[PDB]
Nucleic acid binder design. Structure first.
Ligand SMILES: [Zn+2]
Ligand SMILES: [Zn+2]
Ligand SMILES: [Zn+2]
Ligand SMILES: [Zn+2]
Lengths: 791, 791
DNA sequence: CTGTTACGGCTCCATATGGAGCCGTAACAG
DNA sequence: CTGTTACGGCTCCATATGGAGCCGTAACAG
């Protein structure tokens, strides 16, 4: 009725816990990273609600949506349909923009049709219908095409065509025999240079024969057939239109340009003649949300116009107010939804959900406050509480103190992670958790544990990285200086351009200069001080592997030492074994039946592929003869089965393994097991693995680390550990640059660069620079204002 | 909040109506057929709720579910997600049965794992996993295959292979050249008879070469290639497994047989050794729902077993009780869900929804009481009220008096249909509608209008249709006699076998004997009295056309007369025109640009095909020169634009057109227009069109009409009109047999055949026979008991 | 004029190879 | 012993023609 009773929850590492979540209330789930709160929420409640709603729909719709796996839960009662909002974005299609996603373009079209004065039909203003879409660009506004300068950057035999699937290097490839047939038809030499080729022949080859029929001969068996040359450009365009990695690869060689006729207006030349208050539809859509709302509020109409357009104006004002209160007062209604970050997309989805007014729906949010400045926390909390107040329930998974102080109910898991977590430690109001003596969240909220402000701060040693003439996006031609050898943190409000300035300019230029990559840096003049750097490393939450053949033991490189010490035993020496025998990636020591994968594929008549453990090897991925070899009473499979904490004690007598295992333990991965597949690892686990690998390396003092919000989905203890690890890395001799919005991390940094003073058009500048104490003295700085009370 | 406010509803024929539907209440929508209530419910509320829930899901899930069209409504507030339940069934896959659909097989597996005594793992009892599925049948229980007796029912050149896609009649077809290559390889003559062919050669041809590689030569251009013969049977099996019309066609030639090892148990020989109370899993699943519930209630366990299996037993008992209270006390848990009727599937879905306990969801049901006997009305109403009471709202679209008397709120549309309906006439409680003087439902509920019991009933003239030895399904070898020349109605409780006995036996045998069709009748001895019949006609709600080239004017045949009178004018005579010129199906009088379709196809870069009216012809489907010809001030397009009611007055001077138009008016289609596409017609409109076509024919007195519940989705006035039409058809000279569950239709019949006395195993017999007055005197008959008070 | 049958024409639905990232191994320099 | 570079091998992901039903037309019988 008024509760969500869950019994027998055993998904992932949950230790058969029973919980009662009050309905129509603000509920937050807390715990350490990997403690199972994310599993308990998403894999149980969201999955059960989505399955219960989908299975009751039409058969075709259910088949299209797929067959969701049934969670390992006894029974759940009082479960309304669940909608999950998380930081995930897709390119999707160019047809969708911010206005269409937020469902305000329809209201704008209705208003323009009803009251717009021509210089009147709602479908005339839409670019998704032939009645309004521009004839040339088909309502897209961007004539995407592949320029000839990129297809042929040398004769054909030297590798002129760099496009995938058109490599004429192979003699028997389709491209080779098509080129041979074309050369036979047009009587030209393939080995002739492209520049020396006649323009007509080159144009015919590039753009095809335009439907002309030619004879093509193919040899395996021999035969002949009649067909036509489609052309490289036409085939690439058709492949692009047929269907995200392939889309990104195709768009890499593309050259986006504005439509020559509509100039990106996406509409016919006659639809733009209708204006409201001196601004047509495109000009209104080009304004930022705040100024558009101000213009709508200040708009003056006659009595008849006000009576005929009251409801549309009220709806537009309400939606714009919701969007502003969410925090996106800098975005434009005409901006493409594809070029949006995860936090911006999540906030837009939240605003749309608030505007829709759906009732009786369980809402689950995964860290809505990440990627958002501290000044917008109150607005975000007010929006969340309004969404709850409209007749819904919230299951936010957050680790922010303000969220705990604003939430009605708090559920805490733990007390550790992995095999030590998965059970509820404490629950109730914030006061009850604060008074609870066995809760980590209560301990960190009551002041028992805290992050201390360092007494001594490092200073630059005379090495600086100067970026000159940065003008990409909203950057107003600013020059910044990043000291080398100290912990540098870059702050600023959302949309100020810090993320672009770092990721798409500094990292790309450093990679091109040092790692010898092939990327296009952002619009800037030059970078000074690169000679002081030897390598650039970027650490993110991307998975460390896409195959089941990768595990942390191999990634950290400790598996080589483990195999060496295994082969150094007397049994392997007497049996003539090698260090490579104890590996599930090379034939000789792996199971032959399962090919070392450990699972087998079974095909059903009317079901997808089902995987079961291999019968002969029992999932140990090794043959019996190899497994007979034991080192100190444990075989290779048992060693792979140990966790990092146990491996620390087991391998304490071998320094070369002990150092790596201790690094893995210190980066907070003491609950993980060496045999875990890299595919099953989460973002935090992958980031910790990368940090451990970086720590295990021998630093030369000329390395730069770039991190983009490393505190995503991290508890207070995790933040403390990450701060300690970053300080250790800085003290090693390298330099660390972090884009952070967390005050706890910010206050421990040695240098702070602030970008503001606003977001969007008003941003792109530099407000404050120096140590946090110096930045706190700047009056016109939000970060300084917050650090004034934080310190 | 507590209301669903809809403003500006203009979908289909709705005349801009505003309504307020109370939330969490029993609401019923009433109106005439075609008045727009179905549109107002499904196209507006269900569509808006489904779109609002889908658009907030993941991008991939939203793309898979498709892009739902936005309804033509201003705004809807307080809209919870909507689930629509309607009478629609699909073959789907053999993996799903009644138990799996109702989610009781999982609980049965859990109970068997926990307390079953072997002679213990939940996944061992499931047939959807390799751990429990039978190795031979792969957990299907039916080895579906194509028998050789059906592939070759004459030499190859005479058409031995009757399978689609393997017609060797064409010389250049792939089948022909494959057969030629096989004949060249094996050195045999294709023209040789199949019987005279060696068994080895025939087996090799039928089952392929089993991977053997042979040389195949093909001619258009000439060439050769190496491949293997897959075989007809293997190719057909692969095509069947690749992917409903094609599935039905493939299954027509299939021969379903039980698995030789498991005997249809779908499980391994070891999983059936576990028994509970002397019955294993398959034997429990083979019992009917009522007796299974009785067995579970009477089951005795020890204290430990009761303590360990209390929750599972309680859940199973509750679900079985819900299923029994729904009305399906005769179904078996092991029955395949594919072989279920629309009403049974809808009731099963309702029971599953009740068991799931989803809260805050709007439920829309389309005639849940159709196909259900009168004795189950109270149980169905109680189930609906319980489903509402668990915290939901109901939007049932029903025309049953008991539903009106049980509903909290009633919304009435009308007052007519088509252009006369689409607006709300009255609303409120049942008393308010009864006291309303301008409501058709109130008029029929207050006794102002009623269907009178006929004073005189027709009697048989000595012609009878005797079915001897009917034994299909649950029929217990019964003999029935259907009189010819009178209105015969067949009644009985659900599951008594009347539907099978009629549709799959009598209609099929009559079609085979008279219409010279190719179908397999049900298991019966013979039928006597066929010599008194000349033709058999079956009328259902299936669409009358699948192309936009069919309209009621052509279907009824009146369009030929219209074209003839158009060509008989002086303008056509002077211009040398013919009767075929005024047709949008032959070149010469239709628009060349749109090819007479009236619409054009426009392709977008990243959108599906969009259809817009043709520019040159303005959607009139005719060229200008043809349109210049006018008859009595109206051209052909204007004539097509007229409705039946207007065409009745326009064509009153031509008897050959007036008779057909009057028939169309009398069958209740006075609101439809002659130019309406047959694809857009609903089931009721198609049935009315078929009835009008049958009436327009010249009856020879030797025709039999078979109707299966013609009162589906019909108001009381529609029922009265249909009864009048059926009586007119009977008085014409033919014989009508109707399977009906409506007491109003039953009381007007001349002969009644009752099948009972129960459903399932207890059915398949004949209880009462004779006139309704005679049937009402039978004590052990539910239909007689109801007719006792009805008459 | 009307019903039936046969034929022609139309429409909608159905049915294998190259590339990026990672692991293991050998060689060379510090 | 350790770091770096180069190479080989492995895996997962990506990119047109026959048939059923209907409409129009002509011929034959009542
Ligand atoms: Zn354009
Ligand atoms: Zn194996
Ligand atoms: Zn079997
Ligand atoms: Zn046209």
């Amino acid at each position: 009725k008024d509760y969500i009773v869950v019994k027998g929850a055993r998904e992932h590492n949950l230790k058969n816990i029973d919980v009662k979540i009050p309905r129509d209330k603000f509920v937050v789930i807390t715990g350490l990273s990997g403690s199972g709160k994310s599993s308990l929420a998403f894999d149980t409640i969201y999955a059960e609600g989505q399955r219960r709603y989908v299975e009751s729909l039409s058969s075709y719709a259910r088949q299209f949506l797929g067959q969701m796996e049934k969670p390992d839960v006894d029974y759940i009662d009082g479960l309304s349909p669940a909608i999950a909002i998380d930081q995930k974005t897709t390119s999707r299609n160019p047809r969708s923009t911010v206005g269409t996603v937020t469902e305000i373009y329809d209201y704008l079209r209705l208003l323009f049709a009803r009251i717009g004065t021509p210089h009147i039909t709602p479908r005339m203003f839409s670019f998704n219908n032939p009645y309004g879409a521009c004839p040339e660009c088909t309502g897209l506004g961007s004539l995407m095409r592949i320029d000839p300068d990129l297809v042929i950057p040398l004769s054909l035999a030297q590798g002129a065509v760099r496009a995938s699937g058109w490599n004429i290097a192979n003699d028997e490839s389709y491209a080779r025999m098509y080129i041979d047939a074309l050369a036979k038809h047009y009587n030209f030499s393939v080995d002739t240079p492209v520049e020396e080729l006649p323009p007509h022949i080159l144009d015919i080859i590039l753009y095809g024969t335009n439907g002309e029929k030619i004879k093509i001969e193919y040899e395996r068996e021999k035969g002949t057939f009649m067909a036509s040359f489609p052309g490289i450009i036409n085939s690439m365009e058709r492949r692009y239109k047929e269907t995200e990695v392939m889309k990104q690869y195709y768009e890499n060689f593309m050259s986006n340009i504005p439509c020559p006729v509509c100039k990106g207006a996406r509409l016919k030349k006659e639809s733009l003649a209708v204006t409201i208050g001196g601004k047509n539809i495109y000009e209104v859509c080009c304004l930022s949300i705040g100024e558009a709302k101000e213009f709508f509020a200040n708009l003056n109409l006659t009595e008849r116009q006000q009576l005929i357009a009251r409801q549309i104006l009220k709806e537009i004002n309400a939606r714009l107010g919701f969007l502003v209160d969410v925090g996106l007062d800098y975005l434009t209604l005409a901006r493409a939804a594809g070029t949006l970050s995860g936090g911006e997309a999540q906030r837009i989805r939240l605003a749309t959900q608030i505007g829709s007014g759906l009732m009786g729906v369980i809402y689950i949010l995964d860290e809505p406050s990440i990627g958002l400045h501290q000044r917008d926390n109150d607005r975000l909390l007010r929006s969340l509480k309004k969404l709850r107040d409209l007749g819904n329930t919230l299951l936010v998974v957050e680790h922010d103190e303000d969220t705990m102080y604003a939430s009605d109910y708090i559920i805490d898991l733990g007390p550790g992670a992995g095999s030590h977590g998965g059970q509820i430690v404490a629950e109730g109001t914030v006061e009850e958790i604060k008074q609870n003596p066995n809760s980590v969240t209560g301990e960190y909220l009551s002041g028992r544990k805290k992050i201390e402000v360092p007494k001594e701060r490092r200073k630059p040693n005379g090495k600086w990285l100067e970026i000159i003439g940065a003008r990409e996006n909203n950057l107003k031609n600013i020059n910044v200086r990043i000291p080398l050898g100290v912990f540098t943190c870059i702050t600023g409000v959302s949309g100020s351009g810090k993320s672009s300035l770092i990721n798409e300019i500094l990292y790309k230029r450093l990679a091109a200069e040092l790692n010898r990559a092939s990327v296009k840096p952002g619009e800037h003049d030059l970078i000074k001080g690169i000679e002081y750097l030897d390598k650039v490393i970027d650490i993110d939450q991307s998975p460390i592997g896409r195959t089941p053949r990768s595990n942390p033991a191999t990634y950290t490189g400790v598996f080589d030492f483990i195999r060496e010490i295994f082969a150094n035993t007397t049994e392997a020496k007497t049996r003539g074994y090698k260090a490579g025998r104890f590996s599930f990636n090379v034939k000789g020591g792996r199971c032959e039946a399962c090919a070392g994968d450990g699972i087998n594929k079974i095909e059903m008549h009317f079901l997808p592929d089902i995987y079961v453990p291999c019968e002969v090897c029992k999932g140990k991925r090794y043959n019996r003869e190899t497994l007979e070899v034991r080192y100190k009473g444990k075989n290779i499979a048992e060693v792979l089965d140990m966790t990092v904490e146990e491996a620390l004690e087991f391998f304490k007598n071998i320094p070369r393994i002990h150092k790596k295992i201790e690094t893995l333990y210190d980066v907070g991965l003491g609950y993980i097991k060496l045999g875990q597949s890299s595919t099953t690892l989460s973002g935090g686990e992958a980031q910790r693995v990368k940090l451990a690998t970086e720590l295990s390396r021998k630093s030369t003092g000329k390395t730069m680390y770039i991190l983009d919000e490393p505190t995503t989905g991290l508890h207070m203890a995790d933040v403390h550990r990450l701060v300690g690890i970053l300080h250790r890395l800085v003290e090693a001799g390298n330099s660390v640059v972090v884009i952070e919005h967390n005050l706890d991390v910010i206050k421990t940094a040695d240098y702070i660069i602030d970008l503001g003073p606003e977001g969007g058009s008003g941003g792109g500048l530099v407000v404050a620079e120096g140590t946090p104490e110096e930045v706190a003295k700047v009056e016109n700085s939000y970060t300084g204002q917050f650090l004034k009370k934080v310190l």
